[PDB]
Every structure is written in structure tokens, then in C-alpha cells.
Design an enzyme around this catalytic site. Sequence first.
Site, mmCIF file in Angstrom:
data_model
loop_
_atom_site.group_PDB
_atom_site.id
_atom_site.type_symbol
_atom_site.label_atom_id
_atom_site.label_comp_id
_atom_site.label_asym_id
_atom_site.label_seq_id
_atom_site.Cartn_x
_atom_site.Cartn_y
_atom_site.Cartn_z
ATOM 1 N N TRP B 183 0.832 -1.196 0.000
ATOM 2 C CA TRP B 183 0.000 0.000 0.000
ATOM 3 C C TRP B 183 0.874 1.256 0.000
ATOM 4 O O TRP B 183 0.539 2.251 -0.642
ATOM 5 C CB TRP B 183 -0.953 -0.032 1.207
ATOM 6 C CG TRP B 183 -1.837 1.173 1.369
ATOM 7 C CD1 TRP B 183 -2.064 1.870 2.528
ATOM 8 C CD2 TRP B 183 -2.618 1.821 0.355
ATOM 9 N NE1 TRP B 183 -2.929 2.912 2.293
ATOM 10 C CE2 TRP B 183 -3.284 2.904 0.967
ATOM 11 C CE3 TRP B 183 -2.826 1.584 -1.010
ATOM 12 C CZ2 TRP B 183 -4.149 3.743 0.267
ATOM 13 C CZ3 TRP B 183 -3.682 2.422 -1.709
ATOM 14 C CH2 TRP B 183 -4.335 3.489 -1.067
ATOM 15 N N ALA B 329 -4.704 -2.579 -2.200
ATOM 16 C CA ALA B 329 -3.596 -1.923 -2.897
ATOM 17 C C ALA B 329 -3.498 -2.280 -4.367
ATOM 18 O O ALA B 329 -3.421 -1.387 -5.216
ATOM 19 C CB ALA B 329 -2.298 -2.244 -2.206
ATOM 20 N N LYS B 380 -11.816 -2.559 11.394
ATOM 21 C CA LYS B 380 -12.312 -3.304 10.238
ATOM 22 C C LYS B 380 -11.578 -4.621 10.009
ATOM 23 O O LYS B 380 -12.167 -5.604 9.554
ATOM 24 C CB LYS B 380 -12.176 -2.450 8.969
ATOM 25 C CG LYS B 380 -11.175 -3.064 7.988
ATOM 26 C CD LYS B 380 -10.483 -2.030 7.178
ATOM 27 C CE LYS B 380 -9.020 -2.393 6.946
ATOM 28 N NZ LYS B 380 -8.835 -3.240 5.764
ATOM 29 N N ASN B 445 -6.644 -10.143 4.973
ATOM 30 C CA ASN B 445 -7.058 -10.750 6.230
ATOM 31 C C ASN B 445 -8.162 -11.787 5.995
ATOM 32 O O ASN B 445 -8.154 -12.848 6.603
ATOM 33 C CB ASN B 445 -7.502 -9.675 7.221
ATOM 34 C CG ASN B 445 -6.345 -8.804 7.691
ATOM 35 O OD1 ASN B 445 -5.475 -9.264 8.432
ATOM 36 N ND2 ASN B 445 -6.324 -7.549 7.258
ATOM 37 N N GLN B 479 -2.433 -7.632 9.618
ATOM 38 C CA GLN B 479 -2.846 -6.704 10.678
ATOM 39 C C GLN B 479 -4.088 -7.112 11.510
ATOM 40 O O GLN B 479 -4.277 -6.629 12.648
ATOM 41 C CB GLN B 479 -3.086 -5.332 10.054
ATOM 42 C CG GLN B 479 -1.970 -4.866 9.145
ATOM 43 C CD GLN B 479 -0.776 -4.336 9.917
ATOM 44 O OE1 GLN B 479 -0.616 -3.111 10.086
ATOM 45 N NE2 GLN B 479 0.069 -5.250 10.401
#
Lengths: 585, 531
Positions: B183, B329, B380, B445, B479
Site C-alpha cells: 500500500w 492496494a 475493520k 485478512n 494486521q
Amino acid sequence: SEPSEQVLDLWQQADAVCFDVDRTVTTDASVGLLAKFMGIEDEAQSLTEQANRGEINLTKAFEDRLAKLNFTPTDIDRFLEEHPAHTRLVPGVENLIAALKARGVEVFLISGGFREMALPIASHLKIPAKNVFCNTMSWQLDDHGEPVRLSHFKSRAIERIRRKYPYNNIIMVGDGFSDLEAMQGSPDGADAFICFGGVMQRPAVASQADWFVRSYDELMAKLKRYKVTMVGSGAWACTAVRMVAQSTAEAAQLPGSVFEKEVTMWVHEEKHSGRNLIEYINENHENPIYLPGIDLGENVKATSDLIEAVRGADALIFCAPHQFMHGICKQLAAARVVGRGVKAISLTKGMRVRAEGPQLISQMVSRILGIDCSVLMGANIAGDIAKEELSEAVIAYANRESGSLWQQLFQRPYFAINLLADVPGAEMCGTLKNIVAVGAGIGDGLGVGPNSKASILRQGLSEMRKFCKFISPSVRDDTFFESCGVADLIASSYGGRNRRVAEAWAQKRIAGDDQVTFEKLEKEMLNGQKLQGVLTSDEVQEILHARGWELEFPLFTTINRIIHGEVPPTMILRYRVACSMPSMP
Amino acid sequence: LYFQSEPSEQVLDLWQQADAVCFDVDRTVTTDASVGRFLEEHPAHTRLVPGVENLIAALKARGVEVFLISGGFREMALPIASHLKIPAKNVFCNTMSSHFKSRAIERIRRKYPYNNIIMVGDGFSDLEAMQGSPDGADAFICFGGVMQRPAVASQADWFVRSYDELMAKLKRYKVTMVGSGAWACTAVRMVAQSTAEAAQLPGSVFEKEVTMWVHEEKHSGRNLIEYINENHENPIYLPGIDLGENVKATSDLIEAVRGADALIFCAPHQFMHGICKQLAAARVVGRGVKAISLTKGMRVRAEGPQLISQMVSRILGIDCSVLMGANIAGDIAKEELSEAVIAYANRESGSLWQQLFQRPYFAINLLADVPGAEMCGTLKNIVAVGAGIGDGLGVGPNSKASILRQGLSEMRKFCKFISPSVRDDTFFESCGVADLIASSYGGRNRRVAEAWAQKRIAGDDQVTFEKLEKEMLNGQKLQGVLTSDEVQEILHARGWELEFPLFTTINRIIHGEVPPTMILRYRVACSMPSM
Ligand SMILES: NC(=O)c1ccc[n+]([C@@H]2O[C@H](COP(=O)([O-])OP(=O)(O)OC[C@H]3O[C@@H](n4cnc5c(N)ncnc54)[C@H](O)[C@@H]3O)[C@@H](O)[C@H]2O)c1
Ligand SMILES: NC(=O)c1ccc[n+]([C@@H]2O[C@H](COP(=O)([O-])OP(=O)(O)OC[C@H]3O[C@@H](n4cnc5c(N)ncnc54)[C@H](O)[C@@H]3O)[C@@H](O)[C@H]2O)c1
Ligand SMILES: [Mg+2]
Ligand SMILES: [Mg+2]
């Protein structure tokens, strides 16, 4: 022994029923049953009348029987064991109280006797101490609790109940004069007194009673039992009736069931199958056209006559493709078959354009049939719920009494229900989200990636929100976060029929096929089921054009312009621009 | 008594710190004076002095209020003011039927919160805009293009013949990107597109070259930096994609930052604290630097959340904006239409960052709500992990939409518990609902979480998110699991575990306590006994 028009109504429409303990819930009076075991019978029974407790001197039985003592807590313990408060109950009263609670009627005990006696009875009937209005004996307490003994009671207790709860119809059930008082003393008292002379009659109190009964199965059998009719028989109508049928089958296994076991489903007759469809459904308990392989239970009864399906019905579920709904309501009106006390709920998504404004199905039902109409809106792709995959929905109630009924009807272990007061917000979300699902599927047909699809959904949700505020400002932001809002928009944008067909349309348009239409694809792809998003797109665009809001809602507008071929499908992510751009040649 | 050649440094600084610049019209904005109802203003773009259009745009691009102060005729000047996007209310001029200019500047000082005001013009009227009042201009720039009047020029704080000279001393921001992952590279590519476009005009807000700190890894880093600078492409984290020609990579964190007026932070959040400590210690980040963070994730501090923007502010002593949105991204790198919010520290910075990031394929929406947009971006990824778990179970679209509805709900609740200032409207922006949807159907994710649950149910309970990150992600970082652990620490501290049953169920699933199949039964799963 017999009831009366508006009294019977109050019983059936009751919000709370208050029961006297002594000789209405219990076979024996407490004070005297306690006299035995305490061997003071005649000292008591020489107090339990009207030559003593008929004017007395300044005391009543309860207050005086207390005064008689040198009596200890271990004794009250003993007694409650010798007379376990399950042996004490008049037959049929447990079944009656259970029935009332099962349909959301709140039950109270109101007694002039001793709390220490009413609480075991309350515990047994599943009535919380919070609902027991009854003074305690005067106990010396010390520094934890309880070494040794140290008018208008019922009407006032009813007045406190009325101020505490949203209850409007409150019934008093009892034998004594204290019970009659519950209604006659003060205007905010009970709305009706039913005298129960099953144990002791008492001609003088029975006479001013609103209803005199000898058995509790007299009250039980006047409890309303709702007959349910599903109006519609498509994919969602059938998986809905399947869940609804499971609930009534459960409710009828208990004495005072709030629902008829059998659910009626109106099945529109189609030319290519005629009467054979209805007969297949009744013989095999399956709609093999619109919900194949799924067993609607054995208590579902199909008929093709709309008036006959509806006539006996107390609870109407409206679930038919929305273009048919106006005609269906007009037919039912003309027949005068919908009594004004009927409860309605709509599962339907779509609207009619009226007076340059939106008329949602629930507003259509109210205006034309003159009854109140709730909605059930949620992320609910039918096929999966029909297979009992875990799902959820909002029921937005017309008023709070309805909500309770509908929730009991629709909630299953795999179908969780959330009650909301916001009918205009739930319903408009359910309807508008099918427009966004068309846009989402045009995206899919184009090939756009998750970021871009997320934009269509984001803008779509934001315009749903805006339209809700333009038309019904009452609507609460909270509503968009419930199942009827973001949940539905997502499931339908990723897994619904509108997305699926719109994807195919956009693939073909892009490939050169300028003749393909949503109507043709609906016929080709959905096997009789009805596409709702393009109809909804046009309905809203009519309103946008009329009110001059075409640019207030750019995504709604470019979706309609794309459907109708003024903007190319490739401009879907360019809504800010495509809404005003000049039409294509 | 000669013309002030190079200005005095106080004057230089005043130019850059100007709140408003006032232009004379005749012979400083326009090449002519007047002369010739009807109203035949035949042209109005042939009237313009070279460079003045560029200068006035460059001032507006810096938040500087631009005015017209004319001793001539208003109807004659309005057309000019319109062409230059100067509202009628910013035109001080007489009609058609003396201290005029200093008097006009005194008004400005009364009606606006402007304290640094500069007059630009050719004549004596313009000189008096400064001299004729203690409340007039703070400096006077004499424009000797068109007309050279030595009496005015001798006075005046600055004399120029070309507007190029003024445009060169406008403040100009040097940008470095702190971070070099997927990103950060597609972000850097967009940013460098914007500076390259801006640097085609005389008074560019940005220096053309963008610098990128590329952290050096033990496996492939001695020539990574050299490969990037020569091929203009990060082959490890964003292969196939041309970063611009104006991107320069370095592995030295401190020197990447040393020159920088504008810092973009975009590294996996688990390294941001350390990165912030090092820059603090190197004493290289000045209190004037503009910062924006793109990082999603948090650090647990005082058993409360510290988001990256907060981390930057507290440790580096500067305000930090954030950019947040549904921004997978790879697709943005290929210029697929996408959207993002910039939640700004102050409106002035918000404007700068929008000029830097916004591309024809990357639309930016400015928003004052930093805690909301940033906490949404961070939370999120937890829900995305739960979504991937449902996917790996073969959960249907009703069921997945429940995960998202409950997820979004818990996001909003946590936001309001932590930051009561957050406005509901923020959750409807690209940073809220959009990003949660994009990442629940298309993010890293979701993908890894899916593979993990497929293997679990298929009987492999030795598999780990660390393992899968290594196998599946090619260097990139996960993440969602880290952020689930961070939030859960906060939940366990405040006794909130049951307040957030989906968050809790997701964390309990990630670790061995609850079977993945309980994901749709979070209400019960949050508090069920382990195994
Ligand atoms: N299918 C879903 O997953 C789903 C989920 C939630 C809500 N809904 C909404 O429920 C409503 C109805 O959906 P559905 O799935 O039950 O129907 P459907 O889409 O399955 O349509 C089939 C029905 O159309 C009926 N029909 C055809 N012509 C008719 C006519 N002239 N008059 C009356 N009926 C006619 C047929 O009897 C048939 O039963 C819609 O508004 C829909 O938006 C559907
Ligand atoms: N990838 C996306 O599509 C996307 C989109 C929006 C936001 N984000 C968020 O922005 C950040 C994106 O990070 P990214 O995609 O640019 O990076 P990444 O996950 O693609 O790559 C991991 C990076 O970690 C770097 N790094 C820095 N210090 C390190 C250290 N001490 N040890 C090991 N590696 C170190 C490595 O150089 C490497 O470039 C994350 O916070 C993410 O949540 C990602
Ligand atoms: Mg009694
Ligand atoms: Mg002049």
C-alpha cells in the site's frame, strides 16, 4: 355465568391480568389454613366474617390474625413445608397463568394477606416478586433479617402498575370485595373485574362483577387464538410460512395457545399448472416450483381463493411480489373480509408511486384495508433460511402489542428477531436496497474489483439514508445499522437475484447485445420468481423526476439511466458525473 | 535609492506566511489600464499579465485569500476577478456613476482574521496601501513588469519584473513516504503522480522528487534499494507496477526524513512505535512538519488504544492527519476507480493532502473526524478475519452479512466508548462501511483467515496465522490478528468482553478456546467455556 361484548374484548385485548391470592388462586384461604397447624381455628373463624370483619372495630382479618401470636419464623418455615405452595392451587389456574405469560400478558398477584404466603405461590407460577403487591407481616429484623414478630389497597396497587408500565387494559380477577374495589375505587383502577366463585361464590360481590365464572377453563376458552394466513406463496413466502408453521405447531402443544395450529397459504393460480399446484402442496407439503425440496410442515394448508384464505384470519402476513400488492389489497377491500381488528405484517419489498410520493406496502395495507401493518425486514435470501442456516431479521411493529405476537410467530432457533419501533426506516431500507443490488450487479458484470464495488455500496447506503430523510425524517440513524439496513444491502448485493440478473444483463450489454432486457432475463433465469430492483428503480426515479431530485441522488439516477440505456453500463462508478451527462446516441 | 533587488528575509518569511495578498488590477494583473450601457468587455483573458494567473492559483492552493484593490473601475475589473476565481466580495473598486487602498486593507483586517497582508502593485496608490496607515499592508511588492516607476520601486520591500520570482519563493513541500510495502508503494506512486503534475508549473506546492524509506531486510536488501531506484519498481511488495520516475528510495530512515516538510507514515503498525522513537531521538522532525498516517492498527497504552496518528502527535510533537478508505492496494496500483477519506488535523492540512493524494482514479473526501475514520480503519481488519472464518466454513451470504452487521455494530460501539466525539455520519463514509465491505470480500485478512479455517475444520489444528502469513503473503504483514489481540487486551482490562461478543468470539477462535464453527453463534460463544 356469561360474559359481555366489550368485557370479552378487554379480556382478549388485556395487557395485564391481576389475580387475588385467597380463594381465586388458592383453594384455601391462608389465614385459617395457618389457623390449623396453629390450633387457633375458632379464635380465627370468629374473626373471618362480617360480624367481626364486616365493620370490626378498627381491624381486618389479616391485620388481626397477625396480632394473635407469640409466633416464630421457624414456624412460618414449617407451615410452608406442610402446605407446599403447589398443593394449594385451584385447578386450571396454573394452565391459565402460563397461557397469559406465553402471549406476553403480564400477570400480577395483588393480595391483602401476607407476603410470606404469596411469594411461594408467585415463585411457582413463575411470577416475579416484582409483580407481587402484598404487605409483609411485621417482623423484628436485627442486623440481617427476621427473629420475631414486632381501604383502597388493590385499586391503588393497580394505579401504581398503570404508572409504571405501558399497559392500558388491566383486568382484576378475584372473589372478595377487595377485588371489586380494584375497579370501583378510582378511575385509574382495573378496566374490568372478573369474579371467580369457583371456591367461594359471594352473591353480593358477584353481582357488580363484569363477568362471573366458576371454572378457569371458562376464561381460558375465551382467550383469543389467532388464525394465521400467509398471502403469497413464492420462494420467501414459502420459507416464511415454513417458519411460521413451526411456531404455531409449538404453541398448540400447550393449553392456551395464542395461535391456530393450521396456517393457511394463498397460492395464486397460474395457467400452466392450474389446480394441480395447490393439490400438490396440500398432499406433499412442498411448493415444488418456487421452493423445491423443502418440506413446509404438515400444518400448512394451501388454497387458491384469496377471499377464502383471508376470511377467518386474525393474523395476516403479506408476502407477494410487490407489483401485485395493490390489486390484492383492492380485492380484499371490496370483499369486506378484513375485520378492523386484524393484525397485518408485510414481508414485501417494493413500493407504489402515489401522489408523486412513495407508498410502501405497509402504508398501502393501512390506507386500503384500514388496519395497522408491521414489517419484517432483514438480510434474508430465502433458499438458505429454508434450509435453516442461521439468519436474522428486524420486525418493525406498528404498535408494541403487535411486535410481541409477530416475534412469537416468526422467531425460530435459526431465525433471530429484533424488535424495532422504526417501521418507516426498516421498510424503506428493505425496498431501496434492491436498487443498489442492481447497481452492484452491473458492477460485477463489468468486472470491477472489491474497492469499486464497495464504493457502489457506500454511495448506495448513503443515498438510502438520504432518501429516508427526504421522505420520513423520523427515521433514526440506528436503523441503518440493524439487519434491515446494512446487512440486507450486503447479502443482496453479493447473493441476491437482483445482483445475479443485473450481472448477466451488463455482461450482455457490454458484449454488443443491445436488445436484452431485464424482463427477458427474469423469464430466462429466475424460474417464475420476480425481479424487484428494476421496478423499484423506476418507482423511485418517477418520484425523483417529479420532485426534481435527480441530482440529489446521483447513484440512483445513473442506475436508472443505465437500465434504460441513456448511460453506458461502464459509467456506473462515475455516478457524480453520469447523473447529469448528456444521453448517449 | 535603487530598487530592492533581493528581499530582506523578514520580507521573505512574510511572503510565505501571508494570510492575504492584494493585487492592483491596472498594469499588475492586466497589461493595460482602460480606455476604448452596452458593456462590451470584448475579452478578459487577453488582458492578463503573464504568470499572474499561475501566481494567483498557487496562492489559492496554499489557503491564501486573494483580493483585488483597484483605483480604476469595478465593472472593468469584475470580469478579471471572475476569470481568476476571485469572488466579487474580494474586489475593492469604485463604479462609474485619497488613501483608498490602505483604507481597503484596514477593512479586511476588521472583517477577517488575517494578520499578514501583502500588497502587490505598480503605482503610488499601492505603496500607500502599506505607508498610509498603521493598519495597512505589512509589505509592498512592486511589480515592474509592464511599468517601471523608480519612485515606487525605490521604496517597496521587494521589486520584481516577472511573477516567476514571487512564485519561486512560495513555500514548497518536500515529501517523504515512511514505509515501502504494497500500500505504501501504490500510495507513493499516486503521490509522485501528483508532484510530477504540479512541478510542471512555476509555483508548485510540491517538490517533484518523492523520497521513500525502504526498510532493509536480511534476505534481499543490498540491491533492493538500487533495483528500485534504477527500475522504479518494488519487485517484492508491488511487482509489475511502475512507481514514478520521480521516486527515490533509501534505506536510511533518518536521512529519508531529514529534508522533509511533509511526512506520510505507512508501515505495518507493529513497527510504527519504534519508527517514531528513532525519529524523535534523531531530532530530525521539526514542529512545522505536516504528517499523515495511512497505517491501520493500534498500540495498547495505559490499557487504552493508541492509534498511529496519536502516536505521531505525542512522540514527534506534530499534528497527524489520516487517510482511510476501501483501498485494496493491487487494484489501486492498476488505477481502478477507488475512494478514500482524509480526516484532517486542521482544514489547512486537509487541503494540502487532498492535492497530493487525489488522482482521477482516486477520489478524496475531506472529513474533520480523525478518531472515527482512524478507528474504523483499524477495527475493520478484525471483522475481516471473522468474515474469512465464515468463508472457510462455507457460510452463506445471509450468514456472512450477519457477521458484517454485528461487526460494524461493534466497531461503532467501540468508537463511541473510546471517542464520544465520533459522528455517526463517519461510519457511512468510505473509511467505515466501504472499507469493512471491501476488506471482508477482497482483503488479505479475509484470504488468510479463510485458508486457516478450511484447514482447522479439515482437521489441522497445528496451523497458525504466522505460518500462513509466511506461506501466503510474500513479505506482506497480517494486521487483523494483531489488532484482534490488541483490542482484546483492552476488552479484558475494562471488563468489556461481553459488551463485544463478536470481537471476543473472533479472538477466542484465533486462539484455541472456541471452535471456528461457533462464529455465527457469537452471543453464546463469547462466554462459553473453552476447548
Ligand atoms: N426471494 C427472497 O430471497 C426474498 C427475501 C426477502 C424478501 N423478498 C421479497 O418477498 C416478496 C415476494 O418474494 P417471493 O420470493 O415470495 O416471490 P417470488 O419472487 O418467488 O415470485 C413467485 C410468485 O409470484 C406469484 N405470482 C405470479 N404472478 C402473480 C400474479 N399475477 N398475482 C399474484 N401473484 C403472482 C406466483 O404465485 C409465485 O408464487 C418480494 O417483494 C421480495 O422482494 C424476497
Ligand atoms: N495492502 C493493502 O491493500 C492496504 C490497504 C490499505 C491500508 N493498508 C494498511 O497500511 C499498512 C499497509 O502496509 P503495506 O501494505 O504498505 O505493507 P506490507 O504488509 O505490504 O509489507 C510489510 C512491510 O513491512 C516493512 N517493514 C518495516 N519495518 C520492518 C521490520 N522491522 N521488520 C520487517 N518488516 C518491516 C517491510 O519493509 C515491508 O515492506 C498497514 O497498516 C495496512 O493495514 C494496507
Ligand atoms: Mg380473596
Ligand atoms: Mg496601477
